[PDB]
């Protein structure tokens, strides 16, 4: 069968820390490729995924891409891009080789710029995708006044900058905007001083333990307070200087975590004929010794996006592929238009794009005694919030008031 070549760009080496994402998603990639080949979905053709190690480095990643174009087969599209700086370099140059790219792990909001990255698509929601979800949560609990606590690092300031636009023209006031680089204590005292009750936090795992330490000292916890912070931290992240562990857990009690949903909770059959639960069992059996990755479902759905894209492209050509050098502008535009049509139910829920960006599911968690517990989910397509009954809790008789 003639091959439909795809350029797989990801860190795979054990030497690179982000190689765990690349390797952790490969059993999921193998599962989708195996099924698509068995069903002969791409008949007469077959999906030819070639893997090239980017090593999570700008120079090595660029050479890996360059070597793939020079010595590799004629790739129709790019699959991957995990590390933010490497993905940005490749994504910006795509048009030069008329290559559409589909990432499953690059979450940097920068990539949503279609003036800079027109040929880039992603199955994973970006770091900013938590903002329309937070707005829905604030509306649901009648929280009209908020305070913000942001770590002065690009990754976090990007999220805080996006929040301004999301809360604009909405009946929500950001009464206090506070930033910090190394110590949040000064900013936490200012928030307390301005009587902030609902805090929207954007900071790393290391800074979070410092934030909650300052929160305990300033009594910015309990029935009167609601902390809404990142939901992507390592489990038992707090266990890993002035505060006590019991005092940290007391201030942490009831915080709301926000992050993308790794897999759909709906027991409905997906495009492959399996429910997300059935695919998850298949993935866990296949992965064997390889450690699991939260991007596995996004990589799995990614292969289905490519296969469905190539099908639509094949039909468009027949309505009127082998000689695709990177010179064919028209085919690149056909693939680009075909990918914009993506609309199917996958393992991560409904797979649909809005200007290259994924309209997905956002998970809401709550720290309860010893761990984060799921309390709800936000559907980006329908812009709806579903809060799980008898899970979410408040220390008071009512959820806190915003003033």
């Amino acid at each position: 069968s003639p091959p439909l070549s795809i350029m797989g760009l990801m860190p795979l080496t054990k030497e690179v820390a982000k190689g765990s994402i690349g390797r952790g998603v490969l059993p999921a990639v193998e599962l989708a490729i195996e099924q698509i080949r068995n069903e002969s979905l791409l008949r007469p053709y077959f999906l030819d995924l070639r893997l090239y190690d980017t090593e999570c480095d700008n120079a090595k990643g660029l050479k890996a891409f360059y070597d793939a174009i020079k010595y590799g087969p004629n790739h129709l599209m790019v699959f991957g891009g995990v590390c933010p700086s490497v993905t940005s370099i490749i994504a910006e140059s795509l048009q030069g080789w008329n290559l559409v790219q589909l990432s499953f792990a690059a979450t940097t909001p920068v990539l949503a710029d279609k003036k800079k990255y027109p040929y880039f698509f992603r199955t994973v929601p970006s770091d900013n995708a938590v903002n329309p979800a937070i707005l829905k949560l604030l509306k649901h609990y009648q929280w009209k006044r908020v305070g913000t606590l942001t770590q002065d690092v690009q990754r976090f300031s990007e999220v805080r900058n996006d929040l301004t636009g999301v809360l604009y023209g909405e009946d929500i006031e950001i009464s206090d905007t506070e930033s910090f680089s190394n110590d949040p204590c000064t900013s936490v005292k200012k928030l307390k001083g301005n009587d902030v009750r609902i805090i929207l936090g954007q900071f790393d795992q290391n800074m979070a333990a410092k934030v909650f330490c300052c929160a305990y000292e300033e009594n910015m916890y309990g029935s009167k307070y609601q902390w809404i912070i990142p939901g992507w931290y390592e489990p038992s992240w707090w266990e890993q200087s002035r505060c006590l562990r019991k005092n940290l857990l007391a201030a942490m009690e009831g915080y709301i975590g926000v992050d993308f949903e790794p897999l759909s909770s709906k027991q409905i059959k997906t495009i492959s004929g399996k429910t997300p639960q059935q695919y998850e069992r298949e993935y866990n059996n296949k992965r064997s010794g390889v450690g699991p990755s939260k991007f596995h479902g996004y990589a799995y759905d990614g292969i289905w996006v490519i296969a469905k894209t190539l099908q639509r492209a094949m039909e468009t050509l027949h309505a009127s592929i082998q000689d695709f050098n990177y010179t064919d502008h028209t085919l690149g535009r056909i693939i680009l238009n075909a990918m914009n049509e993506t609309n199917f139910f996958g393992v991560t829920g409904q797979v649909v794009f809005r200007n290259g960006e994924r309209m997905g599911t956002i998970k809401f968690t709550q720290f309860q005694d010893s761990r984060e517990v799921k309390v709800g989910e936000y559907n980006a397509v329908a812009d709806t919030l579903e809060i799980i009954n008898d899970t979410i809790r408040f220390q008071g008789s009512e959820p806190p008031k915003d003033d």
Partner: protein, 407 residues
């Protein structure tokens, strides 16, 4: 015997943010003719150019960097223009053991040896304004300086460097304010905090907005001295902008007496450099090759740096003198060119060419003061030799510069 051809892989921005390639490509073409016609530089070698239009865009440049590296003949050096293009090529370069030599990059971030191990530039870093600033502060006795910047990576980095420079000189930064587009709040704070010596870093559009706000707040006069980059258009404060409230007269008033620093790009002296041209002769020569007038030509003022980049490379290759055996998988020749480039010391059309440890060009700075709606040359400063040429052309209302505080 026959001369061996040796290749430069260059990128010229013919369009984009800095269309410097328009005047820089002919300047490079002239410099190659000059080096190749001299039998005392590379008699065994012929320096040849293979180039592409980067459009001052990293994405666009990524396509051409591939074209330069993956097509015969083998290139011995890479020559990008724009800072954004140089950041991409200088970081990637280590994978092909290539020296990178920029003729137009000013970004302070490019003077990082960890990210850019084989990088050199005949265009100085934007941080070159800082030793001139510290020297003017010391001469005038100021130890308290306020800083105002537009939010751009270049300005953030320039002010970061100014901090470590002031500290060594026993000067401190009192207040630091920033703005993305509107400078109303940062300037109001400068008046509130009673700032006297202010360093302002912004582009032309933002400069007009800063100075309108400066008029409305009476932040000009005997009490105040403004330090700006001398890169603005001829009568910038007079230029019509419908976004600003202030009149031409009110604004010629707000800018009065301010100091500017500008990187010297053409030797003001009438001396003859290595090519045996004068600064004035080079200009006449370059104007002839151009299809359009210098004013219409992008990178005309930076053109001497592109001319000098070719000489820096030629002299470095002459030191090493072999060249045809260069391969992308071998460090040997690269390390030798590197050592020769690092040891560069010659007179060019832009002045004396030397690189610091970071590979960044060391040059003179032109110090000017705005006296009666016109810039007047008040001196020059050489950061390396610590020598200030004073014109005795500067003027103040007090008959002497004011002071940093209340007194």
């Amino acid at each position: 015997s026959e001369r061996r051809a040796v290749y430069i892989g260059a990128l010229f921005p013919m369009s984009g943010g800095w269309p410097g390639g328009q005047a820089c490509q002919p300047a490079v073409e002239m410099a190659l003719e000059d080096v190749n016609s001299r039998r005392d530089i590379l008699p065994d070698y012929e320096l040849k150019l293979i180039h592409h239009d980067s459009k001052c865009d990293p994405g666009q440049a990524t396509k051409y960097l591939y074209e330069l590296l993956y097509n015969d003949p083998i290139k011995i050096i890479l020559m990008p223009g724009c800072s954004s293009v140089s950041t991409l090529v200088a970081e990637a370069a280590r994978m092909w053991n290539l020296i990178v030599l920029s003729y137009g990059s000013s970004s302070p971030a490019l003077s990082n040896r960890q990210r850019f191990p084989t990088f050199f530039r005949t265009h100085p870093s934007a941080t070159l304004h800082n030793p001139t600033r510290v020297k003017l502060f010391e001469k005038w006795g100021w130890k308290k300086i306020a800083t105002i910047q537009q939010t751009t990576e270049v300005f953030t980095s320039t002010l970061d460097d100014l901090e470590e420079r002031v500290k060594e000189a026993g000067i401190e930064i009192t207040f630091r304010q920033s703005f993305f587009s509107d400078p109303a709040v940062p300037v109001k704070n400068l008046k509130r905090q009673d700032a006297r010596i202010i360093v302002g870093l912004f582009y032309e559009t933002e400069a007009r907005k800063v100075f309108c706000e400066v008029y409305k707040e009476r932040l000009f006069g005997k009490k105040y001295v403004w330090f700006l980059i001398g890169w603005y258009a001829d009568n910038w404060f007079k230029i019509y902008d419908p976004s600003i409230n202030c009149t031409v007269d009110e604004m010629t008033e707000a800018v009065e007496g301010h100091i500017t620093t500008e990187i010297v790009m053409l030797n003001p002296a009438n001396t003859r450099s290595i090519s045996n041209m004068t600064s004035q002769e080079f200009v006449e020569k370059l104007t002839k090759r151009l299809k359009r007038h210098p004013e219409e030509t992008g990178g005309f003022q930076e053109a001497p740096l592109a001319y000098d980049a070719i000489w820096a490379l030629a002299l470095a290759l002459n030191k090493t003198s072999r060249l045809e055996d260069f391969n992308y998988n071998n460090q040997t020749i690269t390390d030798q060119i590197y050592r020769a480039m690092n040891s560069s010391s010659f007179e060019g059309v832009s002045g004396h060419v030397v690189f610091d440890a970071s590979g960044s060009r060391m040059a003179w700075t032109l110090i000017e003061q705005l006296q009666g709606g016109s810039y007047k040359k008040i001196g020059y400063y050489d950061s390396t030799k610590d020598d200030l040429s004073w014109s005795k052309t500067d003027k103040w209302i007090g008959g002497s510069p004011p002071a940093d505080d209340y007194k």
